[PDB]
Amino acid sequence: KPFTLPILTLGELTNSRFPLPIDVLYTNPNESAIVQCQNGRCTLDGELQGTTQLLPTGICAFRGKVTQQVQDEHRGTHWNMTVTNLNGTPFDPTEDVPAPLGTPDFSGQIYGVISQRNTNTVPGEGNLPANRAHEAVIATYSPKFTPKLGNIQFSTWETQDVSSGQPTKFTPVGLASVDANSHFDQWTLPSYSGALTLNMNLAPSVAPVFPGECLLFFRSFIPLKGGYGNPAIDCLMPQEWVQHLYQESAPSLSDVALVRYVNPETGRTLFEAKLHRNGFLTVARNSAGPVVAPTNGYFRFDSWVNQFYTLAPM
Amino acid sequence: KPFTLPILTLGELTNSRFPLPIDVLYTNPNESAIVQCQNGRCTLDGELQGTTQLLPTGICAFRGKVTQQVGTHWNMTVTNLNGTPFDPTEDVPAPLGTPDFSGQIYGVISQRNTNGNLPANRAHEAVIATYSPKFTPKLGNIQFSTWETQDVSSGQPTKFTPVGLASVDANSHFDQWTLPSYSGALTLNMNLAPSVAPVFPGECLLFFRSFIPLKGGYGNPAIDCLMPQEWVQHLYQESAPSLSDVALVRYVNPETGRTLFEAKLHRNGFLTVARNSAGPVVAPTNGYFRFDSWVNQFYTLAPM
């Protein structure tokens, strides 16, 4: 079965690391950090890796139950939450994943909404379950962020209206802050089992293997609850590529797929890139920053090549 | 090119009418309402209809700029989701992604200013009443309300991220099959994806049902779509020629190898089954639809 990519312009793609549309293609050759994100990870022959799952609604989402209000050494009202798999089944921490699928894969204060729908009805309140939802923040760098152990904590501005023992959903919306004390670093992984334990079962780090190349990212800008900043989240492949690769499960015929970014109106190649077997792009480029390309462009698979293929410069 | 559906269990599907996972398959034959949703509409040969667009992030989303203060109420111009100005003369009911039902939609309004060289930001919980006379997305303007009383900026890029419903009490006018008046009291809805219904006795519509969060109050509200967003995306990609009236599909259990039931997938992009009761389809979590063959509308479905 021949390898293919979907035919989707940048304006028809979404980020695989946060529920955002893709805004621009982006490079940063001077990056000192190891790139090892865990969402948006899929081999070209359709093996999901890391914490990657298929639902756009599952990216940086949690499902579980609040156990009780707790204390912590920062401002706010704090809650402990057991987490399940996103499909509702109990999370088995001994499974060979870094954390429940969908767990955030970066350091930061993730801002969103916690909502609950009660399991029970209370006598005198009627025959329909009660509900509540409130804004919340999850600090993925906190020693209390332990999703691989099956529980996390979140903080609310709301001081009382969160119920213990009731089904709870976290819908991600953006970041709370990117100030100094908020530790936003998109390439720093959480310690999924907390500070005392090594991460396990990680998708591997990615890097170009041919000199002069750099990683090419699909970049989205992420909302902020407040403060100053223009934070972005870079993914290796958009979520639609993860979904397509999973469906097709086409055998990879070499280590590297030559792909061309094409303008369908002219049929002409704008630039070429290497799509590596593990699921990431490299280009030959001598500028950093967003990529200037027409809005109707998309990647087309050309042929399988080897690691020594020399890309034309962008 | 042979017609196909993706191989995805319910736990791998998302709603095309609100950003939610699919929870269950569902029927309700005694529905008195006209079913004419505008999101999640795609023909089998890949033509999007209504307000349907491809992004899961675009469903019930808005992008635009706040004009002024008008709970506390704010007027917002809306653009296309790609940021380009919406042209009301375009042959669509409203900007693609616009909500397609009556209710108080709850979510977060966020802003990032245009002007250490870093812009200011703010975000607040917000509600959009799609039944309001001020809900006029086809005219390029809507209103939203906040609990927040002051910190919403005029003339700055503004995003609405949907989360659920504010309420489903009497005064909240939730009806998933009542369309908004996209141009308000001033003109009737136009260019709509058509209504859907079984045409032959003994059949009813089959829905992909999601339960939608509530900000407060009592209820277990649901949103039913005709096809999940992944099917819309798949059909759009494939654009396989439709060879007859109906794609016959079978819901199969891959573990036992058995067909559980069959359905008609109509060219306009909706399912019917031979059923005359309301409620869930009780099915194993590993089940999924498989395309069998093209048939015409006179094909008689086996009762499910």
Epitope: Q109, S155, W157, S182 | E148
Partner: nanobody
Framework: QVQLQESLVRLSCAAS????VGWYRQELVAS???????DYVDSVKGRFTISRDIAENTVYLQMNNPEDVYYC????????????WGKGTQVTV
């Protein structure tokens, strides 16, 4: 989510424990934090006095000129504030 309530020549604020409570006018007038720290706009300095009272569950603004509606505003999570506003009271001299 909380409900603040205020009060033409003692204004009380009441809710449904906050980190800052401040009085505004239409610009900031006077604020008090849960450290007990206060601050005043330069035009109000010396004449105005903000004061917190835990025992009586409110925050008063004692004002000691014609250039003088006034509002109560109240929570931080990590380092991110959310503000809650009352509906106000007119002031005219």
């Amino acid at each position: 989510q909380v409900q603040l309530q205020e009060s033409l020549v003692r204004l009380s604020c009441a809710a449904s424990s906050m980190h800052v409570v401040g009085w505004y006018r239409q610009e900031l007038v006077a604020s008090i934090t849960d450290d007990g720290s206060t601050d005043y706009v330069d035009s109000v300095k010396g004449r105005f006095t903000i004061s917190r009272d835990i025992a009586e569950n409110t925050v008063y603004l004692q004002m000691n000129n014609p250039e003088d509606v006034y509002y109560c505003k109240g929570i931080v999570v990590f380092t991110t504030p959310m503000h809650y506003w009352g509906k106000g009271t007119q002031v005219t001299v």
